[PDB]
Amino acid sequence: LIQQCTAFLLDALKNNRPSEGPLQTRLLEMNLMHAPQVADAILGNQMFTHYDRAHIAQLCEKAGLLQRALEHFTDLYDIKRAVVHTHLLNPEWLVNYFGSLSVEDSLECLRAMLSANIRQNLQICVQVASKYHEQLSTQSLI
Amino acid sequence: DIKRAVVHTHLLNPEWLVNYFGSLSVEDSLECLRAMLSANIRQNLQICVQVASKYHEQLSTQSLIELFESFKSFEGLFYFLGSIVNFSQDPDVHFKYIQAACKTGQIKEVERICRESNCYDPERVKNFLKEAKLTDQLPLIIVCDRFDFVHDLVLYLYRNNLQKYIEIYVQKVNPSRLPVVIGGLLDVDCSEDVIKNLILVVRGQFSTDELVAEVEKRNRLKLLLPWLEARIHEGC
């Protein structure tokens, strides 16, 4: 029972003393193959602090976990690939907005996403512009 | 004949259509949907994809897939193979599938299946790549070295251009093949200071042995000495 022994290890992880990054790292790695829903609570509790965010991001990449892969870009700031992957399809709605918002490199991000701006991200760029212009409605925008 | 209500397919109920498809489709309705595509509005288009995924499921005839690819069909055959790519191992149809992903970019969803589906001929497809230039490709920088044909590949690339794909490759994908890559670069007599600067970039799987091998096979090790200084100064 990998599931239940992993759960018991998780119960141990509730205390920071048994909370040892690599152990719970492997636990979450198995979860990514089995159940990603728990990864939300894990990210709340200890994930970003204890885990190898790079390896886990690569895992969620290969596993098609784009939404928590956004949490990973938030963990990793993977500039070109975060840009292109967001450019792919419908992301975590406001999470992507702020992640883009929470950087001054959203400039070049939008340059990229606009170089290939298919009609999907067509309006949303102007929409999120109504999240940066509000601090800097620069002629850079025009 | 029965191939007359194909006009009302613009409005007609596909349920009793599939019912009439239970019969009349034993190598028969193929020509009916064929004529429908001879008048292929978008209405008699998606339903034809659906009925293609109604007979291949009962008879995955290669004649069907051939008459299918006879047209553009790239998205139609895309979904069609998406119903078949699993548990099917024909190299040609898989290459057609990847090329369809190239038609409208569905590579991110295929470059992973190129890793998954390795039941094909990477030589032909990599020749196609060297012919069909995507100008932003990253399926061969994954799957060709997954099959390890990248020596003469990166040779040809250096011949045309090699700026960052080398870099992102050795960074995320694989710094373990980095040695033979460097060796090829030495065979083509590149600018070695570039390789040096890459070594200065944080390395993944990388060690002293392969590095000194690379620097000795050209007997021009006058480059890695600051790397060794850093190694020993840090205590390694």
Using an 8 Å Cβ cutoff, are A95 and A70 in contact? Answer: yes
Torsion of CA B79, B80, B83, B87, to 10 degrees: -130
Contact B108 A58 (CB under 8 A): no
Method used to determine the 3D structure:
cryo-EM
Nearest to B108 among A58, A80, A88 (CB): A88
Cα–Cα distance for residue pair B140/B102, rounded to 1 Å: 13
Cα–Cα distance for residue pair B80/A81, rounded to 1 Å: 29
Q: Exposed e or buried b for every residue in B180-207, given b needs 16+ CB within 10 A?
A: bbbebbbeeeeebeebeebbeeeeeeee
Q: Output the six-digit token pair for B191.
A: 């600018």
Contacts of A85 in chain B (CB under 8 A): 108
Contact B172 A62 (CB under 8 A): no
Contacts of B108 in chain A (CB under 8 A): 84-85, 88
Contact A85 B108 (CB under 8 A): yes
Contacts of B172 in chain A (CB under 8 A): 58
Cα–Cα distance for residue pair B131/A68, rounded to 1 Å: 37
Best of A85, A87, A88 to disrupt the B interface by mutation (most B CBs within 10 Å)?
Answer: A88
Residue B204 CB partners (closer than 8 Å, separation 6+): B170, B171, B174, B175, B176
CA B88 centroid distance within chain: 16
* DSSP state for residue B220 in the 8-state scheme: -
Using an 8 Å Cβ cutoff, are A112 and A84 in contact? Answer: yes
* DSSP state for residue B77 in the 8-state scheme: H
Contacts of B168 in chain A (CB under 8 A): 80
Cα–Cα distance for residue pair A113/A118, rounded to 1 Å: 9
Chain A: give the shortest CA distance to residue B112, in Å. 8
Nearest CA in chain B to A86: B108
Contacts of A84 in chain B (CB under 8 A): 108
Cα–Cα distance for residue pair B133/B112, rounded to 1 Å: 19
Resolution rounded to one decimal, in angstroms: 9.2
Nearest CA in chain B to A87: B108
Residue at token pair 């599931």:
A3
Contact B112 A62 (CB under 8 A): yes
Cα–Cα distance for residue pair A21/A18, rounded to 1 Å: 9
Nearest CA in chain A to B111: A62
Q: Output the six-digit token pair for A93.
A: 């709605």
Residue B197 CB partners (closer than 8 Å, separation 6+): none
For CA atoms B205, B209, B211, B214, the dihedral sign is: negative
Q: Output the six-digit token pair for B61.
A: 């005839």
Q: What are phi and psi of B122, to 5 degrees?
A: -65, -20
Torsion of CA B110, B112, B116, B119, to 10 degrees: 50
